[PDB]
Amino acid sequence: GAMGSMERASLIQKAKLAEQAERYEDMAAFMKGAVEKGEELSCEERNLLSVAYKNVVGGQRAAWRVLSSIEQKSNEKGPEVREYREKVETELQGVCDTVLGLLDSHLIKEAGDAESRVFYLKMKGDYYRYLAEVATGDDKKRIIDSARSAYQEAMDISKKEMPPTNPIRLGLALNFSVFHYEIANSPEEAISLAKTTFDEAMADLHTLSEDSYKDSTLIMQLLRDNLTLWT
């Protein structure tokens, strides 16, 4: 693609510069180019990929929610609100499809270690979840089940291969809980997952260094925040 002529190391360096400059669309394009070099990604590099696309799709989702709310109030005028909501929606779907394409070609199939495989399967669940937030057609149930299946495989691996305080295990459980609550209309499952994840992490904190303790308790607090919101 457009980044084919740039060195992998230069793409990674520029992704870090783009993050410092809060230029997340550039950051995502640089990291897409780095993935397309065909080599596996390091821990740090996977984080850069995730940060970049999370910020891009995060702005699109926030805009879509603003426009969808205006559209709902309008249907309680002309086609413009629907048209512009559709424009933002299509761009969001394009970004999600791009990320899912990188995971499928070929990040997931080459990811053998628990840390990388769970990371990418969590990403796959997340981006199918973002597709599910805007879905309304014949394939909406299949989109939801694609999110569920990816989260579920990641959960099964993380429970077998990682300690309960592992940050990627915690962040996966957090997001699968949000999937249950917001997408699958399963609030009891969401609450049960968040509580069991929190409690089993709490019991494993004694094994950690001060720095690992900080990392794990930060994500546990997000689980606690959702539990307080939901109960």
Partner: peptide
């Protein structure tokens, strides 16, 4: 409000 998914 909307719930927290993982965020930095």
């Amino acid at each position: 409000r909307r719930p927290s998914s993982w965020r930095q």
